[PDB]
C-alpha cells in the first residue's frame, strides 16, 4: 500500500463483512440468494422479492445488525433481464459503524411489498421508484407521482423512455393557457458513440458466448 496512485486495501473490513454476510445467509436461508463483497468493502445481500419485510426487519432489529437508518432506496432498470428492475436498499448501522446493501428484483407487473412498516424513510423513496420506474409497491400508505408533472404519462427513468420525452410545453395565446404538444427539437441531441473497441479490464471478461 506504498504506491502513491493506487487505493490501499482494507482487508480487516473485508473479512468482517464477509463473515457477517455468511451470518445473514445462515439466519435467512429462505430469502437469501447470493452474498458478495466488493474490492472496496461493500457488502451486498441479494434476496428473493418475498423477503423484503423479513430481511429488512431482521437487519433493523437483530442485536448484531441494528441497521436503524435507511440511507437510500432506488431502482435500476436492466432491460435484458427477465425482471428488468432491481430494487436496492442501502442501510446504515450507527451501532456498528457499518453499511450493507440489500437487493431484489421485479418486473413491470409484479408488486413488491412496501417497507414503510420497517423504515418510515421508505415512504417517499417508493413514491419516487413508482413515479420514475413504474414499480408498484403494495400496501403503501399513499402511492402517487412525486417528481413528474401532473398527468405525465410514462416513466422517465426507464431505459426505453426517450431522453427528451414525447411532449413539451409552451404558452398558446388562443386558449390563454399553457398547452402540451408533441416534442420537436430545434437541434436534435447528438448521439456520441464513445465506446472503445478494445477491452479495458481483463478481470471482468465474460465467458465467450
Amino acid at each position: 500500500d506504498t504506491r502513491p496512485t493506487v487505493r490501499p486495501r482494507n482487508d480487516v473490513a473485508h473479512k468482517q463483512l464477509s463473515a457477517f454476510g455468511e451470518y445473514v445467509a445462515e439466519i435467512l436461508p429462505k430469502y437469501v440468494q447470493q452474498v458478495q463483497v466488493s474490492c472496496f468493502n461493500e457488502l451486498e445481500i441479494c434476496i428473493h422479492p418475498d423477503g423484503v419485510i423479513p430481511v429488512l426487519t431482521f437487519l433493523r432489529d437483530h442485536s448484531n445488525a441494528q441497521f436503524k437508518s435507511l440511507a437510500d432506496l432506488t431502482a435500476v432498470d436492466i432491460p435484458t433481464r427477465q425482471n428488468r428492475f432491481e430494487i436496492v436498499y442501502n442501510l446504515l448501522s450507527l451501532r456498528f459503524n457499518s453499511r450493507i446493501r440489500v437487493k431484489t428484483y421485479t418486473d413491470e407487473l409484479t408488486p413488491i411489498e412496501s417497507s414503510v412498516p420497517v423504515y418510515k424513510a421508505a415512504n417517499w423513496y417508493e413514491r419516487e421508484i413508482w413515479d420514475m420506474f413504474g414499480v408498484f409497491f403494495a400496501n403503501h400508505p399513499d402511492l402517487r407521482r412525486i417528481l413528474t408533472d401532473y398527468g405525465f404519462e410514462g416513466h422517465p427513468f426507464r431505459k426505453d423512455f426517450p431522453l427528451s420525452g414525447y411532449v413539451e410545453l409552451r404558452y398558446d395565446d388562443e386558449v390563454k393557457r399553457v398547452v402540451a404538444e408533441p416534442v420537436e427539437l430545434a437541434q436534435e441531441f447528438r448521439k456520441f458513440d464513445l465506446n472503445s473497441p478494445w477491452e479495458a479490464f481483463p478481470a471482468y471478461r465474460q465467458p465467450p458466448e
Binding site: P156, L163, E168, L169, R177, V178
Partner: protein, 155 residues
C-alpha cells in the same frame, strides 16, 4: 407645441418607471443565489431603487432566475399574468434562457420565452451578481427609450 409637451411627459413617466423597479420575489434555482448577492451589501440593488416585493400585484419586473420545468410553467404564467402593467421580464441564466444544462430533458422548458415574453436575456451559469446588475441597468435604458406618449400623439 404639443409634440414638445408629450416628449417631456414621456421622459417623466419613463424616468419614474426605471427609477422604481420592483422585482417580484421569485427565484427558482441556483441563479437565485446570485440574485441574493445583488441585494447583498456589495452591490445593493436597493440603492438603484430596485426593491423586491412578494406580491405579483405590486411588482413591475419578473426575474426568471433558475430552471423552468414543465410542472412549474403554469405557475410562472399565472404570476406573470397577475402583474399589473407595464411589466417587464428579465431572463437570468442559461436554464431560463434556453434550457442550459438541461436543454434535452423530458421535464424542462427550453427557455422561459416559450411561456412569457422576455425583455432582457442575462447570460451565464449563473451570471455573476454584477452581470445581473448589468441587465437591470440595461432594462432601465430600454425603458428610458420608450415612446408611449409620442406614438399616441400621432395616431
Amino acid at each position: 407645441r404639443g409634440e414638445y409637451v408629450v416628449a417631456k411627459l414621456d421622459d417623466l413617466i419613463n424616468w419614474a418607471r426605471r427609477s422604481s423597479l420592483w422585482p417580484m420575489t421569485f427565484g427558482l434555482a441556483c441563479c437565485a443565489v446570485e440574485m441574493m448577492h445583488m441585494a447583498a451589501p456589495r452591490y445593493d440593488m436597493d440603492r438603484f431603487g430596485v426593491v423586491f416585493r412578494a406580491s405579483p400585484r405590486q411588482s413591475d419586473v419578473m426575474i426568471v432566475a433558475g430552471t423552468l420545468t414543465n410542472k412549474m410553467a403554469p405557475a410562472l404564467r399565472k404570476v406573470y399574468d397577475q402583474m399589473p402593467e407595464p411589466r417587464y421580464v428579465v431572463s437570468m441564466g442559461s436554464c431560463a434562457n434556453g434550457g442550459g444544462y438541461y436543454h434535452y430533458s423530458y421535464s424542462v422548458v427550453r427557455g422561459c420565452d416559450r411561456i412569457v415574453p422576455v425583455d432582457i436575456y442575462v447570460p451565464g451559469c449563473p451570471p455573476t451578481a454584477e452581470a445581473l446588475l448589468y441587465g437591470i441597468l440595461q432594462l432601465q435604458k430600454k425603458i428610458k427609450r420608450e415612446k408611449r406618449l409620442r406614438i399616441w400623439y400621432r395616431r
